[PDB]
Write a protein that binds this ligand. Structure first.
Ligand code: HEC
Ligand code: HEC
Ligand SMILES: [Co+2]
Ligand SMILES: [Co+2]
Lengths: 106, 106
């Protein structure tokens, strides 16, 4: 999977979680989101290829993925507790992470 | 001023930006939010009263204010460039910073 494929996985599985009503469905989708975020986590994106890996911009970009993974992990723990609706609300709050990184990079 | 005071300041002024009757109110409210955020960064939230100042919890709490301030500064630059509608639009996305830290520690 490349960056575009990883982002489509994140996009679609957010909606899977919204559509769901049980813990197994939400867990399955969050697990898919976690793998997609981890797949995209380490690559330097094209607009930052000329920046140093420790540059402020690259640091903030990598932190965007690390922080997204952290909150996916937290939502997954809620799903593993059978707390379906709390896990769904946590998943909805992931959208803040998506929009924050997009706004920086675009 | 204490943490509750600082949060009232942030809440009132975020709404001032949403409702600003004139463009100049936006920069004035961002200025007050910046100071409130830097003050709140020096407090201990009640739910973390039993945590070390070096705990990952207090680290993430303090970092959230640095990041909020960074995005307040972006909005201030827009308003100082006279791009006051862009600044108001940016201020809207500050709500994600509030929701994120609250999810953890409010
Ligand atoms: C940086 C730390 C990012 C995070 C977190 C998320 N995305 Fe992303 N996204 C990022 C890049 C560099 C790109 C490619 C360049 C571009 O601006 O398109 C993308 C692209 C997408 C896309 C495709 C285009 C679009 O419709 O916006 C989608 C659908 C997308 N991203 C979705 C998405 C979601 C749902 C995220 C959070 C759950 C998310 N992205 C996080 C960088 C980063
Ligand atoms: C952490 C980095 C935070 C950020 C960023 C914001 N807030 Fe917050 N807020 C935080 C905590 C730990 C608490 C609990 C404080 C307590 O003493 O219990 C709060 C609380 C509030 C409140 C309620 C205040 C009260 O009197 O109980 C409000 C209205 C509030 N916060 C508003 C607010 C807004 C609008 C923010 C974004 C602009 C924001 N806060 C950021 C921690 C953090
Ligand atoms: Co967090
Ligand atoms: Co940022």
């Amino acid at each position: 999977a490349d960056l575009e494929d990883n982002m489509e996985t994140l996009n679609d599985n957010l909606k899977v979680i919204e559509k769901a009503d049980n813990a197994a469905q939400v867990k399955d989708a969050l697990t898919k989101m976690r793998a997609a975020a981890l797949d995209a986590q380490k690559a330097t994106p094209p607009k930052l290829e000329d920046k140093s890996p420790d540059s402020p911009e690259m640091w903030h970009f990598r932190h965007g993925f690390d922080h997204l993974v952290g909150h996916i992990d937290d939502a997954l723990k809620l799903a593993n507790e059978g707390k379906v609706k709390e896990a769904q609300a946590a998943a909805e709050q992931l959208k803040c992470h998506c929009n924050h990184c997009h706004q920086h990079y675009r």
